[PDB]
Amino acid sequence: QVQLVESGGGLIKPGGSLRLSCAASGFTVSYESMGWVRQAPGKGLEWVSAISSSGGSTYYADSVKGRFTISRDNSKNTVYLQMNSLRAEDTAVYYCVTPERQCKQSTCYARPRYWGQGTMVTVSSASTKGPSVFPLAPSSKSTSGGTAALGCLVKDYFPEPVTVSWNSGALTSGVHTFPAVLQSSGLYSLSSVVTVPSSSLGTQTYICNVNHKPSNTKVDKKVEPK
C-alpha cells in the first residue's frame, strides 16, 4: 500500500471536460494494471475504467464509454483519466486503486498496491445564488425544564460556504449547524439547530444569521412558535 499523488478534480457544468491523474512523487512505480473507482454521494462503489500494465488494453464501464479515456505515461509514472461530456451522473469522488487480478503467481500476490487520495468531481449547471432561509419552528411540546429545539433551513444556495450564527453570535451554547448536502438541482442546502430553555420561549426571540458571501447575502430569520 503506497500512495500516488492524485490531482485534477473540481467543478464544471454538464458537457465540460476535466482530467484526473495519479503520479509517483520521487520514486519509480513498478508498472502494472491500474483502475479508477468512483463513489457517488450516498451510493456504492463502481469501477469506471482500467488499463493494463503496458497501457494497450483498456476497460470502460457502459455508462462511461466514449466520454472517458484512460491512459498512462510510464516514462512519467503517471496514469490519466480524461473525462469529457460530463453529466450530473458523473458527480462522485474518484479513487486511484490498483485492480485485483486473477493472480496465480508469486509475482501477482506481493505486487505493490497503489492508491490515490480521492478527488471530488462535481458536475452542476448552477452558479451563484443566495439562500432561501426557512424557520424550523419549535414544537407543541415544551417542558418548563429545557427541551426546546428550533432551527432554520438554508435551502438552494450556491456555492459553498455559508456562515450560520444565532442572535449575532450572542447565542452559542448548543447549536449544531450541519454540513451541507448537494441535491439533484446542483444547489446546496443545510440547516442549523439550537436547543434552548423553553421558559425563554415566547419572551426571548431567536434569529439565525445565514451569510452566503459568494452571493453577498445574509438572512437573519426568526424562529417563533406557531
Add this chain to the structure above:
Amino acid sequence: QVQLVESGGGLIKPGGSLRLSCAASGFTVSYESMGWVRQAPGKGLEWVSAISSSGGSTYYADSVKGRFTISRDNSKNTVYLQMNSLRAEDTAVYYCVTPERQCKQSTCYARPRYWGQGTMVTVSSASTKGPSVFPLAPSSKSTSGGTAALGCLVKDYFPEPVTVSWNSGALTSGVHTFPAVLQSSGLYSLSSVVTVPSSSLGTQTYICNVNHKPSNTKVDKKVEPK
C-alpha cells in the same frame, strides 16, 4: 458452435492496411465478447485482440497495439479487425473465435460459441519473379532393381502457382511435387521428386518442366548423376 462468415484477408506489402471481419449470415448473434486468434506458419496460436459484448472494452497484444484496431457493429452482427502498418511478423492465418471467460454463471456456460473459417494475411515485400531451378541429383547408391529418387528444387519465385512436370508429361508414375513454402524473403519455394528405375539411369535422361506463368517463365532442367 455456430459459424460466422469471415472476410477480408489477402496479400499486401509492409506498411499497408487490411481489414478482417466476421458477420452473421441470416440470423442475429447473441452479443457477447469476441476475440481474434492468429497462427503464423509453423508456430503456435496467439491472441491478438479481444472486445467486450458492448464493444467498449478492448484488449490488444503488445506486438500489435497501435497498429491494429478491433471494433464491432452490433446492429450489423459484425466484428472487425482493422490492421494497419502491417509487418512480416503479421503473416498468419486469423481466426474468429469467441473467448473463454471466467463464467461463474449458467448463462456464460451455455452461451453460443461463434467461429470463423480462418483467412490468410500475407505481408510480403516481394512481387513477380521467375523461379531458380536446381537439380537434386541421384545418389551414389543405385540398386539395379529400382530405388532411384531424383528431383528438382524450385527456389525463390513469386507468386503462386508453379506447374511442374517431368519430360513434358511423358514421365508421370511416382512424382511428388510438394506444396510450396513461404520463407523469410517473401518468396515461395518447392521441389518435385520422381523415383525411377536405376537401370534407365545413365541411358534415360530426365528433365523437369517448371512453369511460373505469373512471370511467364518455365525451366526444363536435367537431373544427371555427378
Add this chain to the structure above:
Amino acid sequence: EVQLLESGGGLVQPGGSLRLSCAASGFRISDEDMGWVRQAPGKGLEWVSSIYGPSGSTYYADSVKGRFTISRDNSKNTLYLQMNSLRAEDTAVYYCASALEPLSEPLGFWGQGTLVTVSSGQPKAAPSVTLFPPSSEELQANKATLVCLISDFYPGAVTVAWKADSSPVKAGVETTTPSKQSNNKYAASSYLSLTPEQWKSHRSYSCQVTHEGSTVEKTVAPT
C-alpha cells in the same frame, strides 16, 4: 443480478476482534477471487486481503499479516474476514470486493461496506433525532422539505429510512455522510423533498434512523 451484502463490524477497543461477512448471491465464492478493501479519509481505498481460488493462497497487506484472516465458507456461500488484535489505524469502512472480470457487464462487484471503528476513550452513543415538518413559509412558497437532524452518536455511521404513512419512500431523499462534532461524536442530516400535494395527502411521515441497528425515529403530520 448478483449481489454481495455485508454484515458484521462495529466498535472495538484496541486488542479486540471482529468478523466481517460477505453474503454471495447469484454466484459461488470459490470460483471467484474475492478480497477486502478499507476506506479511510485521506487513505483512499487500500486492499488489505484477498483470496486466490481453490489453492487457498492468500494475500495480506504487511500491516495486517498475522492479525487478519481471509476465508470462504462454501456451504454458506460467504466470504469472511476475521480481524484480531485490532489497532486504531484499522478504523475504516471495509468493502467486500470480487475479482474484476473485465469483459463482463460491470467490471467489478462491491459490497455495501460496513464501518469498523477501533478506539478506547470513546463509548457507544445513541443518536439524538428531531424531525421538522415543512414550514408554513415554505409551503406557501410552493415547495415542502422534511428535515431530519441526527446528532451525538458514536461510532460515526447511520442509515436513514423515510416512510410515508407506512410504505418506504424512494425519491427526494438526501442524507449527508456522518461528520465529527466538537465533542468528537458525529452528526448527520436527512432531507426529504416533497411537493405540497403529497404532504397534505398523507396521514404521517416518519424518519427512521438506525445506528448499530438502533431504530430511533420521529413522526410528523400536517395536523
Add this chain to the structure above:
Amino acid sequence: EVQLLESGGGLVQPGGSLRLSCAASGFRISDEDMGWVRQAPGKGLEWVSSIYGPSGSTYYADSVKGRFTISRDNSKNTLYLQMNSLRAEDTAVYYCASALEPLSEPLGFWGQGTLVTVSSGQPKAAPSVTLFPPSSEELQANKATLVCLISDFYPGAVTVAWKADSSPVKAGVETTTPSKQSNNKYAASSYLSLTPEQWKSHRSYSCQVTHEGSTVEKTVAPT
C-alpha cells in the same frame, strides 16, 4: 515463463477412445479455467470443453457431451480430456487453452496442439524420407539449401528436426504442414537454408523426422 505442453493423441478407429494431457508449468490448473479447442480445415477453432474452477462445473459442446470428459489432476498439475466413442467428425488438431486473463502479459496461453485422427479404412504408415545435399549449381550460385522430402505417412502429422553434425540447428528451417496425397497418405517438405561456409565447415547434416515418435532420418555430408 509459464508453459502448457500437450501429450497424447493419435489414430483411432470409430468407437475407440483417447486421452489428451496438458502439462501445466509455472502455475496450477485449479485456479485457472482451462479448456480444449479443436482445429480442422474449414472448421476454424471450436471450443469442445472447458472446466470452470473448483466447483467442477463443466461446459461441453453438444456434439461431445456424453462422450468427452474434462478433468484436472492437481497432484500432477495436469489437465486431461478423455475422448470416448470417437467418430470421424472428431478428427482435428486439439489445443490446450487456458482462461484469458486479459490484463496480463499475453492474454491467453495455448498448448502445442496434438493431432487426433479417427478413421477406419486407413492404417498406420511410416514416412518415406530422402535428403538432398545442396546442388553444385546452387553452391556455385553463392547459396546452399538442404531439401528433406517426406511422403507416404498416415496420419498427417510430423515434426522435423535438423542437426548440424550433432547439435540441433535454429535458423533457416522451413517445413510445410502435411498435405494429403493421391493415395490419401500425406506429404511434407523441410528446407534448411545455409551459407556455403557452414556447409563445407561441418562433417555432416541430418534431417530427423518423427511421426508417432518415429525417428526416421537421413545424413548428408559434402564428402
